[PDB]
Amino acid sequence: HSHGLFKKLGIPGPTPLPFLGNILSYHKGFCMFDMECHKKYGKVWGFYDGQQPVLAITDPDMIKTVLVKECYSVFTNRRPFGPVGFMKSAISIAEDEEWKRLRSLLSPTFTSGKLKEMVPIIAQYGDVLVRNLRREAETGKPVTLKDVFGAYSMDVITSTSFGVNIDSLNNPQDPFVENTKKLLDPFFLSITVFPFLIPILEVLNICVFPREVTNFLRKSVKRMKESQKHRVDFLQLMIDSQNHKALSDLELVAQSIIFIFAGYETTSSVLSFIMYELATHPDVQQKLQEEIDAVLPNKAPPTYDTVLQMEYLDMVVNETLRLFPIAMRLERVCKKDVEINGMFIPKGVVVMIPSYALHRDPKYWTEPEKFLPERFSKKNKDNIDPYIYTPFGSGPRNCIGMRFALMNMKLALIRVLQNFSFKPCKETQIPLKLSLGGLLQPEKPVVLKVESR
Amino acid sequence: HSHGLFKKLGIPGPTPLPFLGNILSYHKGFCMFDMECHKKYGKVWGFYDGQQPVLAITDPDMIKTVLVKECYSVFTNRRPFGPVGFMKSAISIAEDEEWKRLRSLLSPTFTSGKLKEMVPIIAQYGDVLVRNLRREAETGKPVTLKDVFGAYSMDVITSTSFGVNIDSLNNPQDPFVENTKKLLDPFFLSITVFPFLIPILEVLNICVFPREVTNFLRKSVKRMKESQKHRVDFLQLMIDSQNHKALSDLELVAQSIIFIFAGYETTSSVLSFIMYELATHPDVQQKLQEEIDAVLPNKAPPTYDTVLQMEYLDMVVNETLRLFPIAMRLERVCKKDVEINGMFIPKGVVVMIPSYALHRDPKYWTEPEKFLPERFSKKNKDNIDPYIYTPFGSGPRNCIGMRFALMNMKLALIRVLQNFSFKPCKETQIPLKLSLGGLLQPEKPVVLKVESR
Ligand SMILES: C[C@]12CC[C@H]3[C@@H]([C@H](C/C=C\C[C@@H]4CC5=CC(=O)CC[C@]5(C)[C@H]5CC[C@]6(C)[C@@H](O)CC[C@H]6[C@H]45)CC4=CC(=O)CC[C@@]43C)[C@@H]1CC[C@@H]2O
Ligand SMILES: C[C@]12CC[C@H]3[C@@H]([C@H](C/C=C\C[C@@H]4CC5=CC(=O)CC[C@]5(C)[C@H]5CC[C@]6(C)[C@@H](O)CC[C@H]6[C@H]45)CC4=CC(=O)CC[C@@]43C)[C@@H]1CC[C@@H]2O
Ligand code: HEM
Ligand code: HEM
């Protein structure tokens, strides 16, 4: 019973209940609990996720030492997570010399050279979504964004794997779309109060990934493994290293699964938050629709170079990620006893960075609740501390697919705004009350109208 | 998660926390939590010991139906308790047709005829304690009551087994006194919030009775089993039925162990509460010392008949048990769906009777906090509801050794008050603040002076 660790180091925090800790404070979500703890205890505080002590830091120098400086030596892995089954070899779940091995073997797959060659591949499903998006513009019915974007994000992330060319929104039955789309609840709440039951669930072969499909995705990838014109994509640029070194056949499959759990919901959710802001702020939607027509006249198809050229588009993507950081938190496990930026961090304490709260702190942001894309203009690019705004993390273990996610979301935003306009509807929850659950989602699916240009 | 069972039946109670329930309210002990719930919700209320719902009843008709009337059909066993190892065959822990079997096979061992023949046996250790009690009367030092009474209660309960004749207070080293005297804490608090971990502890052969001595007490009883003048005692009157019917060799050993865990601390603790009241109320000690000298002149040795003759002695024993009911609670497990005295009791709910709170309810008792032995005079014997004052329980599953415990405690009180007087000391906690733990004990051991007559 080590619930007195934060009163021992003189670090303030809410009163933890026995065994439970401060998990009852999650009744308002992580975000509201992070904002209240920030406006109460200040720069550094602590709490307990059961018996797990979590130290929160908000100083830019302290965040840099944890994320960048002493990352390899001290803060290398995130908090343990189980049960995983055979999926502990995933890079986002791997630890130590297995992770840095996997990090290097998968780093060249996210190179701008490899990314410029993926432009014609993922540009073939933007017009696919436009065809499916025109279906509901003439119907006159409001459109759920997570369903149209989810199909596009699926057809993009699958074509970058090997890949497969499906029309997910028009084909909701092939044995590869529904098989995949199975991607603070009664289960995850118990494994935090009872982390000692995790080794039990592993010997029972129970996993958070239902292994009714993973073994399919094993021998469907083993079928698509080996059994001209084979070009840039994830599985190919991972199979070249298949023939510290080499990637097991099962390890490479785990990295293919983690990329789908990586790109699918994260791309579609952020795209949903972007179209909500463009609807609730039609002035931003018009100024963006004019920079697209300027860089790309005549509804020209976008290229790799023309996307980096649009600056007001990157300002819209960055300002939406500030209001809706889908990561919410950034966590690192303290390996040994260190003293960073003044204070001493004991061994085994999870260091957490409240990304959602810092993105709405009035000390760094003017009108925090407002959606002001001008916050990221070249006139204002420098008034932003890089260690306060981290929607993709920072340091050696940041988002490995940041350049892919930004290019994939922007390419969809361009060809969608080239043909469609967005004016809010009645069912539109305004202001959008965020999901009080355990992941940054809309409480009710973002349902908006869709019109044609 | 069935924490909404009491709001479902319209039964009031404190708000239960998830998984924990109302166990945090035990921070003031069971008694203070029972008194507060009685003066708040009234006749019937409920709470949760983790996921276990507990319905408390206080109506005399409702208590009679649970304890007496529908006892065999519905309320037969107490709440499950583990881990026990081989000790689940104990009568206090046995259930159903195994208990009623064990209840009948052990009932004749507590017969008044068998009890009158135990008078000369246990009267040989009263003078043993007087010899050891005189040692500290001349020393001039205060005496801890639980140590002198504990040795007497040990020398009595062991001589009634087979038995063994030791001088426990003067011989604290023989391989039978210290071997036995091993008789809301970090362990029991966890098995109430985690009752699902009890089957785990059983397959590991872990037991609440440390089996470093139980197997000794197995083959030390197996040694004393079979390997003229053999007369009335527990093991002999249980070995006659050894040669539904018959008592396994291991079952009979379990009943011998449960009797030591039955008589030892219960007899010594109540005897400690009695001498505290006689000290804090010297007027009661004088009137009792005069009835003993009247029934037993010349310091005559007590007999079976002369103990039942002393009425003011039984009034002192009964009034002390009211202020200090060592059982505190009486619990029964509901077997099926029944509707007793109006309300419907669902299957699986533990029915609890707050014995401590009812013994201090001003609705039945005048000056509840006062020690008034005249409450049990023949002039006042009838103003007491028999289902409100139950220090030995009531019904088919009440205290099987009530007649033995009353006779054993009174015989000690007689020959002690015949030779010694008691005047309180400085270290004497006045008023005696009861132990806030998980069993009715003194917070600090009752340390009083001892003088000779
Ligand atoms: C950006 C990212 C999604 C968000 C992830 C981030 C990466 C994930 C960390 C552990 C993986 C665990 C298994 C997993 C695999 C997947 O691939 C789908 C999502 C899940 C199920 C995770 C979902 C959140 C869980 C349940 C946490 O509560 C503890 C355990 C986490 C799950 C680091 C992380 C740490 C945080 O603390 C906030 C959320 C983020 C930022 C993902 C890497 C690519 C993916 O796009
Ligand atoms: C009067 C009695 C002592 C008091 C007992 C009563 C009889 C015991 C019930 C279950 C036995 C469990 C194993 C046990 C064996 C022993 O023999 C020593 C004490 C222990 C360790 C018990 C101690 C209290 C425990 C830990 C409870 O918290 C749940 C589990 C109980 C233990 C019924 C009971 C029910 C109550 O709810 C209040 C207390 C009482 C009245 C005893 C029968 C003889 C003995 O003299
Ligand atoms: C809007 C889209 C995305 C956002 C906002 C995002 C953000 C993040 C963040 C905040 C982290 C954690 C950084 C840290 O802990 O310091 C992360 C890690 C990671 N991301 Fe993303 N991501 C996105 C899309 C993607 C995509 C498209 C992929 C893969 C195709 C991907 C794969 C990963 C992986 C594998 C990790 C873990 C890397 C490691 O642990 O070494 N993410 N991402
Ligand atoms: C001051 C002394 C004692 C008191 C106040 C006392 C009180 C009690 C109480 C209240 C119960 C539970 C009744 C119920 O649940 O309805 C009980 C049960 C029991 N007592 Fe005692 N007791 C005492 C001494 C003894 C002694 C000396 C023995 C044995 C030698 C003993 C053996 C038992 C057993 C075996 C049970 C359980 C019976 C069953 O479950 O069927 N007790 N007692």
Side-chain angles (χ1 to χ4, degrees), chain B residues 308-441:
Chain B
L308 306 174
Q309 181 178 356
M310 302 181 181
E311 298 205 327
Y312 192 75
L313 175 61
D314 183 61
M315 297 161 49
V316 171
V317 177
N318 292 337
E319 231 293 316
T320 308
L321 287 171
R322 187 194 64 85
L323 286 170
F324 301 106
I326 53 117
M328 295 185 299
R329 293 182 177 181
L330 298 177
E331 300 179 0
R332 296 294 187 273
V333 159
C334 192
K335 276 180 181 301
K336 63 187 183 68
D337 291 307
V338 293
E339 192 150 22
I340 55 172
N341 299 95
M343 63 187 310
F344 158 79
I345 316 300
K347 158 173 57 183
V349 175
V350 169
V351 184
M352 184 267 297
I353 294 92
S355 302
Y356 179 93
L358 297 181
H359 292 186
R360 299 168 178 264
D361 189 11
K363 198 160 189 172
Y364 292 88
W365 310 104
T366 308
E367 346 280 21
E369 310 299 324
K370 279 296 182 179
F371 176 76
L372 311 180
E374 298 287 352
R375 225 180 296 257
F376 296 90
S377 282
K378 290 198 180 307
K379 115 201 69 175
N380 263 317
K381 276 292 192 185
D382 314 331
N383 288 10
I384 302 169
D385 197 311
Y387 292 90
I388 303 300
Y389 174 79
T390 49
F392 300 91
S394 181
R397 199 160 188 171
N398 69 326
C399 188
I400 198 179
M402 169 177 52
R403 258 150 282 269
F404 179 86
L406 288 169
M407 186 69 62
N408 184 25
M409 291 185 301
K410 287 178 181 178
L411 281 173
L413 291 177
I414 292 175
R415 301 205 62 170
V416 159
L417 290 172
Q418 278 181 334
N419 293 33
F420 293 87
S421 296
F422 302 86
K423 247 275 299 179
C425 177
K426 299 182 181 61
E427 297 79 276
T428 307
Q429 171 190 68
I430 301 175
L432 191 143
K433 306 247 180 178
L434 216 147
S435 175
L436 215 70
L439 52 156
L440 192 116
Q441 305 294 284

Side-chain angles (χ1 to χ4, degrees), chain A residues 17-20 24 190 194 196-197 200, chain B residues 17-20 24 190 194 196-197 200:
Chain A
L17 303 184
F19 302 94
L20 252 58
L24 292 184
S190 301
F194 318 139
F196 52 89
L197 298 181
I200 293 188
Chain B
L17 303 184
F19 302 94
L20 252 58
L24 292 184
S190 301
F194 318 139
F196 52 89
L197 298 181
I200 293 188

Side-chain angles (χ1 to χ4, degrees), chain B residues 23-299:
Chain B
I23 64 105
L24 292 184
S25 302
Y26 286 166
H27 77 308
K28 216 128 301 179
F30 316 138
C31 301
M32 302 287 95
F33 175 68
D34 291 325
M35 300 234 64
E36 287 172 332
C37 287
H38 186 45
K39 65 177 298 181
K40 169 116 61 179
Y41 302 107
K43 240 177 181 59
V44 153
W45 71 93
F47 60 97
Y48 299 89
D49 282 349
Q51 302 295 130
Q52 175 63 229
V54 179
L55 181 70
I57 59 177
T58 56
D59 185 77
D61 287 354
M62 219 172 305
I63 296 177
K64 180 172 183 174
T65 307
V66 176
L67 296 188
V68 189
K69 296 176 181 176
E70 300 220 40
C71 174
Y72 299 97
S73 59
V74 191
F75 314 94
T76 305
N77 333 297
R78 307 185 180 97
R79 72 168 69 192
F81 180 56
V84 292
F86 76 102
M87 283 289 299
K88 66 247 307 173
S89 300
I91 172 180
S92 62
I93 327 177
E95 308 180 299
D96 270 313
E97 317 279 20
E98 196 182 32
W99 163 81
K100 190 168 185 175
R101 156 182 179 267
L102 288 158
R103 183 77 175 188
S104 298
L105 298 166
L106 300 183
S107 296
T109 56
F110 299 92
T111 301
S112 56
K114 316 260 195 171
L115 189 63
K116 192 172 77 67
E117 262 183 332
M118 293 184 182
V119 170
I121 282 80
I122 62 186
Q124 233 63 28
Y125 306 95
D127 12 67
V128 162
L129 188 57
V130 170
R131 289 174 54 256
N132 298 336
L133 200 59
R134 194 100 61 183
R135 195 81 55 176
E136 358 277 36
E138 56 214 1
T139 313
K141 67 177 189 63
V143 177
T144 304
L145 306 177
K146 69 179 186 61
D147 286 312
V148 285
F149 283 145
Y152 165 82
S153 180
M154 182 95 281
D155 300 312
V156 160
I157 203 87
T158 53
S159 311
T160 44
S161 69
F162 189 63
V164 189
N165 305 42
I166 336 155
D167 193 359
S168 300
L169 200 58
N170 211 342
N171 314 330
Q173 47 63 42
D174 48 288
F176 220 94
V177 289
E178 187 272 347
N179 173 87
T180 53
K181 280 190 176 184
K182 318 295 292 185
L183 314 140
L184 267 167
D185 99 303
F187 178 68
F188 292 100
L189 229 194
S190 301
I191 61 179
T192 310
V193 185
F194 318 139
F196 52 89
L197 298 181
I198 296 182
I200 293 188
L201 303 155
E202 285 280 28
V203 305
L204 311 187
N205 214 36
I206 297 184
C207 175
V208 293
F209 311 102
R211 282 186 257 196
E212 85 213 22
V213 38
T214 75
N215 16 92
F216 173 90
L217 292 176
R218 170 152 60 181
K219 201 121 289 186
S220 75
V221 164
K222 179 52 202 166
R223 138 135 189 177
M224 87 173 57
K225 255 183 56 64
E226 301 179 350
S227 301
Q228 152 147 48
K229 203 168 303 304
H230 85 314
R231 56 175 62 182
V232 45
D233 52 61
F234 290 153
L235 176 57
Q236 195 174 127
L237 305 170
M238 291 181 53
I239 215 70
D240 55 4
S241 295
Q242 277 274 10
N243 309 277
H244 96 49
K245 19 130 256 319
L247 277 63
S248 176
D249 278 321
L250 187 62
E251 279 187 319
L252 145 140
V253 169
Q255 314 301 317
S256 303
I257 299 174
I258 203 65
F259 289 160
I260 302 178
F261 276 97
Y264 177 77
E265 183 139 345
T266 56
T267 298
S268 61
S269 298
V270 177
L271 283 178
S272 300
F273 290 117
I274 293 175
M275 310 317 297
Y276 169 83
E277 300 301 321
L278 298 182
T280 60
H281 303 75
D283 22 307
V284 180
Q285 184 177 165
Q286 176 179 343
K287 186 181 178 182
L288 181 49
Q289 279 173 330
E290 291 169 345
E291 193 198 40
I292 298 176
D293 300 359
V295 178
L296 289 174
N298 240 278
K299 305 181 308 168

Side-chain angles (χ1 to χ4, degrees), chain A residues 307-363:
Chain A
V307 173
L308 306 174
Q309 181 178 356
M310 302 181 181
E311 298 205 327
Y312 192 75
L313 175 61
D314 183 61
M315 297 161 49
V316 171
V317 177
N318 292 337
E319 231 293 316
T320 308
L321 287 171
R322 187 194 64 85
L323 286 170
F324 301 106
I326 53 117
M328 295 185 299
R329 293 182 177 181
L330 298 177
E331 300 179 0
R332 296 294 187 273
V333 159
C334 192
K335 276 180 181 301
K336 63 187 183 68
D337 291 307
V338 293
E339 192 150 22
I340 55 172
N341 299 95
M343 63 187 310
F344 158 79
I345 316 300
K347 158 173 57 183
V349 175
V350 169
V351 184
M352 184 267 297
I353 294 92
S355 302
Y356 179 93
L358 297 181
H359 292 186
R360 299 168 178 264
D361 189 11
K363 198 160 189 172

Side-chain angles (χ1 to χ4, degrees), chain A residues 117-182:
Chain A
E117 262 183 332
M118 293 184 182
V119 170
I121 282 80
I122 62 186
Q124 233 63 28
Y125 306 95
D127 12 67
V128 162
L129 188 57
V130 170
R131 289 174 54 256
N132 298 336
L133 200 59
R134 194 100 61 183
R135 195 81 55 176
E136 358 277 36
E138 56 214 1
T139 313
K141 67 177 189 63
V143 177
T144 304
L145 306 177
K146 69 179 186 61
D147 286 312
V148 285
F149 283 145
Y152 165 82
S153 180
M154 182 95 281
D155 300 312
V156 160
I157 203 87
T158 53
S159 311
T160 44
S161 69
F162 189 63
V164 189
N165 305 42
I166 336 155
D167 193 359
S168 300
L169 200 58
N170 211 342
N171 314 330
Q173 47 63 42
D174 48 288
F176 220 94
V177 289
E178 187 272 347
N179 173 87
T180 53
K181 280 190 176 184
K182 318 295 292 185

